[PDB]
Amino acid sequence: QSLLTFIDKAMHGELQKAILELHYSQELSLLYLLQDDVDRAKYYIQNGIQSFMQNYSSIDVLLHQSRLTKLQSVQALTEIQEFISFISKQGNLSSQVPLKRLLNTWTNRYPDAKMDPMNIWDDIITNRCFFLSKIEEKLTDISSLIRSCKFSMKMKMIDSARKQNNFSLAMKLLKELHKESKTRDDWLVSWVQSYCRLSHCRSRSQGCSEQVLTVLKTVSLLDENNVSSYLSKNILAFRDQNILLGTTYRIIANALSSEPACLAEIEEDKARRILELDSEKVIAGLYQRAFQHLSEAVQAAAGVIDAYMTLADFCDQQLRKEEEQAYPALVVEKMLKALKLNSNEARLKFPRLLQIIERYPEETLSLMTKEISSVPCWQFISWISHMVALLDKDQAVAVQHSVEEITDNYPQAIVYPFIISSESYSFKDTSTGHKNKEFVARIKSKLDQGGVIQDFINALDQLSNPELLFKDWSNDVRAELAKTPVNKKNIEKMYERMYAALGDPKAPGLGAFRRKFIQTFGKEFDKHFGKGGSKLLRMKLSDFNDITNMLLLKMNKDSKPPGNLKECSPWMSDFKVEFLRNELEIPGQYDGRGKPLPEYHVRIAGFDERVTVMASLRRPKRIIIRGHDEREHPFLVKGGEDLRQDQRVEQLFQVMNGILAQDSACSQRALQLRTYSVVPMTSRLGLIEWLENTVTLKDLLLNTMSQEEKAAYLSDPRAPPCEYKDWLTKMSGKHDVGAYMLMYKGANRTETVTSFRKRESKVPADLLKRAFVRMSTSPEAFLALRSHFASSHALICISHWILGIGDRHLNNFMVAMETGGVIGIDFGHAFGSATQFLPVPELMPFRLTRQFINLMLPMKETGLMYSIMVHALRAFRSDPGLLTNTMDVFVKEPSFDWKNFEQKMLKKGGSWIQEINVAEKNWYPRQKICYAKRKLAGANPAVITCDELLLGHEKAPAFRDYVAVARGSKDHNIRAQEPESGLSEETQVKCLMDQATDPNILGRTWEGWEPWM
């Protein structure tokens, strides 16, 4: 009797109406229907709806998330509307069918988890149970139907509150709900199910001291009923009980394995509880109990897929612990039993089988054939590039007929990895080593029934640039021959390609299609190629490439590459689709994920009679080709680069932002990755996607300045390039690379910071906001221009570190001016090696210069990017470990086994040249995954940098000064003051953000990285 009297006296006058009815009207209608004036309530709710529309109308179109917070309330508004209309009209007097229909449309129409926060959840569920209680009191099976509706909505609210990190509300609701689940049985077992699942999710967030106590709490609540006379009735109740109890025993035996004995020191009765179920004779006991419960679980829709998968992961981490039994049989058994069904996590769990077959060949390989025989073939499509290189490996015959099923059904995608694998495939002497020759010949025959794909690859090949291949040949011979001519057949096997492409003007006319400029350059290679065909065929000269040097000097003079047409490549200029020749079906499709239907696939129809050449370090070319489905598609071509590892890291991006769309707090801010696409047609030739009106970052920052700001920045003696290089030469005495080794003995920590500020002072700070006001001209849109750019840039600068990438200078960042997103490209170094194998090691994890700082004025740069980075890492380290195993089988996959990597560094502008001699070893595919697992499992990021710097630059002259630069000073940097291991997320990202901006680190770094701007 407190609020209704207040409102019944306050409802007078004008000033006690023009706020109180302008604002609410809806809870006003609610308390009015509590006092039962439905027509007054009808007026107030219609005013509520009209106020919703009027409040909607004045908002803008691009102010996001306020539209969403307004829009979510309309479910509640029309729920009150349906209730008042249902209780007014009385055809529902005693006929129960409107109650049945309303129960059905209530239990169908649900607010979803992971996008609706708990306040709106509370609003709609409180309104719904309140209206149901109103029907319960008004109109005096059916009430038990009402009670089941109430509890089902409540437990749904519980299981939605678990996912969105809101544990205390579910604690309070489960605490108030236990007195309800005593008239029934399944209510009680779902109560204890939700309890143990919530304690599971709490334990991952909890510390090890807290972990043991909460799991002792849930096993203490696992001493009650629901085992008697219902696990026989519902066998799935027994199954899920065994699942959860095995998960508890799993997590406690996980808990007493990280710290050796310190956890088993302080308890008395719970210490007796540990050992009643030494110090190893109960660890193995808990592991045996967990395996026994998981065995009963997999012994007893889609309620058993997870039961298989947890036992698979259990034995998998057991096997990884063993290398760092019948369990390798059991894991492949239940894993393929899972993958036969429609799964996704098992679809990402294929290289476990692909490596455990090689490691355990005697362990039931006939079972592997027999189980891989019975599988739908629309699954393996994403994992084809490993199985195509597996044919050279002995015992490649655990599956052949499903592979042939996939080829005979969908050959037009597998045609691209097969040329790459057949380029290097050498079998053995045994009879199974000739059956593999028979198999590769029969599938080379079952492929290329048309005989036009190879022709298309050739026609795309012969539009390239000849000087680039000339430099490639010169560096290849200077590498492989100038040391010692002990190499078998390599000089001829390289010279056959040099004579085929860019030889005489008629050998490409016979073995390929004559392009309209090989008659200008392969013809021009006649007189200096006569001596080439005379002596260069079998020279073994091993000393001399100055004749190659003077010819690459005088072969850049008349270099003209703009054909600007498709007379440059006369095959596709006159394509003119004729009939069924089993058409090409443009590469870049068949991602997997279900049954691919090629009737909707786009057929490559026409090409464009104009090309544009780019300005990069390889000068690529684009095409604007046109498909059968009436549109255009642009693409860029790249000749002489391997493009398989980049496809793998794009697949890694795909799986990690598959993880990002699963938990709550990152989904509610909609954080994704701009995943473009590559295709490796043959080795050293691939097609890359190109997106729409996209500017490089250095292009934007150069275009922003004035005409005189440009010349004062670049063409000046006080240029921060020239000033930095002049100061670094004067503080060294020398003039080239190696002065970055002379600087770390003879420079102090703070005077270098002042000299850094000297060049920081020159360039302005408002350049990014000047470029952002140059285009926007609207304070309504400036907010949603800045916010999306900052969000995306923080997300990519925190996902470019979990897998360690380096070499991020300004040209590797692509901003889309129409929307305001930023995406990075050009993955050079997959794990932490770009600071290892360079002369001067860059030590920052990612870019954070003064421009991202001075855009965030007047905020400190510790509020906006901080929240999204801590949400990123809290989303990362709560996984079963998919990213770990996928990175492991990526780096262990043979594609860059140090020779491809050194050839790739020669394929770019190579700062590193030679003098390796121990770097052939210390590649070490155990150390990289070990240290990535450390830097995911909690590690101070001043320790990982020291670890890889020691591993890469042991016995270097300037090493400890490098570590002392990247070590702190115990007063100026928090990283020297923070510990070295066992950290948490907020202090992790605090150490990381302080590590990023650190004016000793930005003092001495490579001048191409351009650290000032």
């Binding site: 709806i49 029309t78 509307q81 026409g606 926007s776």
Partner: protein, 969 residues
């Protein structure tokens, strides 16, 4: 305006200066009553009902709190005169104030003193209680005070002067009419009082019998002798006395004015005919004498009253000579020779023959079996009168258009009892019926229902005879449809006649002595297909490039057939969808097959799709569809066909085929919804400037979401929803002016918006879940929203220096433009659109004018694709501008101050991707004319002085033409 006058009425119910604001309050009530009739809009009609039903201002308490005053008498009278016209200005939404106005009229009978104020309260009172029919509310009209209080108002009142003494007898017969089940135990003394009152009022010695208590007592006698009708079965004493009462009440030769009592006696003997049955033998001669006298008194309502009393007496005479056929030979002989003498053929103009017609048609009945040969010359003589009297094609001087349904009912009633028809005059009879049903809209109410009963009577008559005659009814409706559809009265009074004949046959069957509506609906659908067969609707081009095909031929072959085709489709819309219950079973396949067989031959004729919409809507109104399979798969092949046919059309056909497409059953067509989703995409885009397609699109999205399985549609919500953001952003004046003096009331009796869609969109968007709604705003965030949110250049050129006398500041006269062009493209407002166009023309001239002494080719490309779509847009003024402007600039850009500056090739590519585009069809035609002008003045100037490396030359655009001719697009 409204309700402030009512608050002034509340402030002036007790304001000062008694007898000092009577004219203020009176002009207040008259001012509200003016604009309470001067609004033909139901929104304010729904407003004012809730206005007048209030308890603070208004009427219900103002009739109780403003009585004892001298300051406002005209106000008290004007409100009770205004309420009795607002009783029927609205409908019957005054039902929850039956008891409120009951205690109101108790209060104003008691407390008020005046009589000229007492009368209009009684007016609205009795008209309200007549407006109510026997139902719940009369049970709370307490007869214990309604009879007894107002009956002791008779008793405990002497010198009851005139106008309440009549009104109390009006009240007690009013409630005798409406729900007399409360009036069982108050019957005996009241009729004794009714005898004694008129006894002392008329049969006294020296008193002048004044009219009003006679009128009241006779109306009460009629309205109370009906519930307990007193025949020769109740009391054979007051039957005799009431008989002599009403007969002296219709005594002739009393020539006077104010003919209340004779018309009252006529209206009473209209009802009470069959009651005084055995006393209708006494003075039948003088009964007929006064009937023949007062039949032609030449007073306006007295004619109708006289003929109604006349036909009622003739009906009872025919009934008594029917049921008592033994002793009545003399009586039937007298009426026989009388009517044959009056039909004899001498000079009878429209009086003796007009009474001859009805009595002849009625007396066909009795003598039908005594002789059977005079019955044979019966209807032969009747045709030999009516055929010669009708159809003379006298353009000036034969308007017997008010006498017709009498003739029709008579010829039907004589057509009944015959057998073996002379059957030669039947193409005169059917011509008579089609003439009468043709000249139907120049009638009045209560003429129309008599005519409807007549035509239904004759259709019942000539359908029990034989199927040799059952095709006259088939052909007369065929002729009638092509008559009524020809004349563009336009067609809008035949519609409810066709409704009344087949629909409300069921209220005709009672008095008159099956499958009638079956037969008439079958005949109607047969006629509407046989008419639409023989029409030849084709169009022929008269003697540009037409690339549309609802194309530039505005001329069809027979233009007077298209009018009687669109009148056909509108009549079909108004009559068809009612009652698809049992009759519309078999025609679902054959009629649909016929319509598509015609429409496949010609696509571009609208209304065919409207016929298809009508038959598919009745097919969804019936169930019938749970799998003939022929017509199922026929619609399957038809829908995809029209859904790919409707692409390159224009608006007025697009709306019709969309109303077809989204009215498919389509819960039974579960497949290929990806071909229906561009139709529903275009439907809401063509909403918000046209209502009913935007209504039916939501009405069908409801059907989709509530009846289909929500898994195929579960990805198909990302492109239905996110377009919906636009939704959630006469003689009454002179018949009211000069008082409410009831002739103005007689002349009053002679004479879906967007916000409901807003409410329904919100109810839909709420009822369709939480997890689905989120895509509604997440559409692209990269389109012309952001392109209106981008600067059109890096730096701003075109600095404008406004002229002043001292200062002259500068203004960037380009910052207005992304609102200026979106305004001038479509303003949706005819006053501001022309101003936007003039401003934009001057702006374009200025931006050209600065260019003779900075680069703007980033701006020209953003400028021109609205200059084209406004040069050839819609209106005449926006065509007369921007067309010579675009010719001026295209000829300037094809010149020597031109000649290969990026601006010229920019203009060229602008008009070229003007040519190649999806559906904007007229634009491509316009820029084809532009490239023709380009081809003219480009090459018709330059001599070969530099005409060898000009990339603007026609060879380059020939290569461009080859490129456009070479695409799989």
């Amino acid at each position: 305006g409204v309700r402030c006058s009512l608050l002034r009425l509340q402030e002036t119910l007790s304001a000062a200066d008694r007898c000092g604001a009577a004219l203020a309050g009176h002009q207040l009530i008259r001012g509200l009553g003016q604009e309470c009739v001067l609004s033909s809009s139901p929104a304010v009609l729904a407003l004012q009902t809730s206005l007048v039903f209030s308890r603070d201002f208004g009427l219900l308490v103002f009739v109780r709190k403003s009585l004892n005053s001298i300051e406002f008498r005209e106000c008290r009278e004007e409100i009770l005169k205004f309420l009795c016209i607002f009783l029927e200005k609205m409908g019957q939404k005054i039902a929850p104030y039956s008891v409120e106005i009951k205690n109101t009229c108790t209060s104003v009978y008691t407390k008020d003193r005046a009589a000229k104020c007492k009368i209009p309260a009684l007016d609205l009172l009795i008209k309200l209680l007549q407006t109510f029919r026997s139902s719940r509310l009369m049970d709370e009209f307490k007869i214990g005070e309604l009879f007894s209080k107002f009956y002791g108002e008779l008793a405990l009142k002497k010198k009851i002067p005139d106008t309440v003494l009549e009104k109390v007898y009006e009240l007690l017969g009013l409630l005798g009419e409406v729900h007399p089940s409360e009036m069982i135990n108050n019957a005996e003394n009241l009729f004794r009082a009714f005898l004694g009152e008129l006894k002392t009022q008329m049969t006294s010695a020296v008193r002048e019998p004044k009219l009003p208590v006679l009128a009241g007592c006779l109306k009460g006698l009629s309205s109370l002798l009906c519930n307990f009708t007193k025949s020769m079965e109740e009391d054979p004493q007051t039957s005799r006395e009431i008989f002599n009462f009403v007969l002296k009440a219709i005594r002739p030769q009393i020539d006077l004015k104010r003919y209340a009592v004779p018309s009252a006696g006529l209206r009473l003997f209209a009802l009470h005919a069959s009651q005084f049955s055995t006393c209708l033998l006494d003075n039948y001669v003088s009964l007929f004498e006064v009937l023949l006298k007062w039949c032609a008194h030449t007073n306006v309502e007295l004619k109708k009253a006289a003929l109604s009393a006349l036909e009622s007496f003739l009906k009872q005479v025919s009934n008594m000579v029917a049921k008592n056929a033994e002793m009545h030979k003399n009586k039937l002989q007298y009426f026989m020779e009388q009517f044959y003498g009056i039909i004899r053929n001498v000079d009878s103009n429209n009086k003796e023959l007009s009474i001859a017609i009805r009595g002849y048609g009625l007396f066909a009945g009795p003598c039908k079996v005594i002789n059977a040969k005079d019955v044979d010359f019966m209807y032969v003589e009747l045709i030999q009168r009516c055929k010669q009297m009708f159809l003379t094609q006298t353009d000036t001087g034969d308007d017997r258009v008010y006498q017709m349904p009498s003739f029709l009912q008579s010829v039907a009633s004589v057509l009944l009892y015959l057998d073996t028809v002379p059957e030669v005059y039947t193409p005169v009879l059917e011509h008579l019926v089609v003439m009468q049903i043709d000249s139907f809209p120049q009638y009045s109410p209560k003429m129309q229902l008599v005519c409807c009963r007549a035509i239904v009577k004759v259709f019942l008559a000539l359908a029990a005879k034989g199927p040799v005659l059952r095709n006259c009814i088939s052909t007369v409706v065929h002729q009638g449809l092509i008559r009524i559809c020809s004349k563009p009265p336009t067609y809008k009074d035949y519609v409810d006649l066709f409704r009344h004949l087949l629909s409300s046959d069921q209220m005709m069957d009672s008095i008159l002595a099956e499958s009638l509506n079956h037969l008439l609906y079958d005949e109607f659908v047969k006629s509407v297909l046989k008419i639409v067969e023989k029409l030849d609707l084709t169009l022929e081009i008269q003697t540009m490039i037409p690339t549309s095909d609802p194309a530039a031929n505005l001329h069809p072959a027979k233009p007077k057939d298209f009018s009687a085709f669109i009148n056909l489709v509108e009549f079909c819309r108004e009559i068809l969808p009612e009652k698809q219950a049992e009759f519309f079973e078999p025609w679902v396949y054959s009629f649909s097959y016929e319509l598509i067989l015609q429409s496949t031959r010609l696509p571009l004729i609208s209304g065919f799709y409207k016929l298809l919409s009508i038959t598919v809507r009745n097919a969804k109104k019936i169930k019938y569809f749970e799998g003939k399979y022929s017509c199922f798969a026929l619609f399957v092949k038809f829908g995809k066909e029209v859904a790919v046919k409707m692409k390159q059309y224009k608006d007025e056909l697009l709306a019709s085929c969309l109303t077809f497409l989204l009215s498919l059953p389509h819960n039974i067509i579960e497949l290929d919804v990806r071909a229906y989703v561009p139709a529903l995409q275009m439907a809401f885009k063509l909403g918000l400037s046209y209502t009913p397609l935007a209504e039916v699109g939501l009405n069908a999205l409801e059907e989709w979401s509530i009846y289909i399985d929500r898994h195929v549609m579960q990805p198909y919500y990302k492109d239905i929803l996110p377009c919906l953001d636009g939704y959630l952003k006469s003689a009454l004046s002179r018949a009211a002016q000069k008082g409410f003096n009831k002739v103005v009331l007689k002349h009053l009796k002679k004479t879906i918006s967007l916000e409901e869609i807003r409410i329904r969109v919100v109810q839909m968007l709420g009822s369709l879940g939480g997890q689905i709604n989120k895509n509604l705003l997440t559409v692209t965030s990269s389109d012309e929203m952001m392109k209106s949110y981008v600067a059109w250049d890096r730096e701003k050129r075109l600095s404008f220096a406004v002229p002043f006398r001292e200062m002259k500041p500068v203004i960037f006269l380009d910052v207005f433009l992304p609102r200026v062009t979106e305004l001038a493209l479509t303003a949706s407002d005819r006053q501001t659109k022309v101003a936007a166009c003039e401003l934009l023309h001057s702006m374009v001239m200025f931006m050209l004018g600065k260019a003779t002494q900075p680069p703007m080719y980033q701006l020209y490309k953003r400028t021109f694709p609205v200059l084209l779509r406004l040069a050839c847009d819609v209106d005449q003024v926006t065509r007369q501008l921007y067309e010579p402007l675009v010719m001026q600039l295209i000829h300037w850009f094809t010149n020597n101050k031109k000649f290969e500056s990026q601006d010229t090739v920019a203009l060229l590519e602008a008009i070229l991707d003007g040519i190649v585009d999806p559906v904007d069809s007229t634009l491509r035609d316009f820029c084809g004319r532009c490239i023709r002008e380009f081809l003219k003045w480009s090459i018709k100037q330059i001599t070969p002085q530099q005409q060898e490396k000009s990339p603007v030359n026609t060879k380059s655009l020939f290569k461009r033409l080859y490129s456009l001719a070479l695409h799989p697009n």
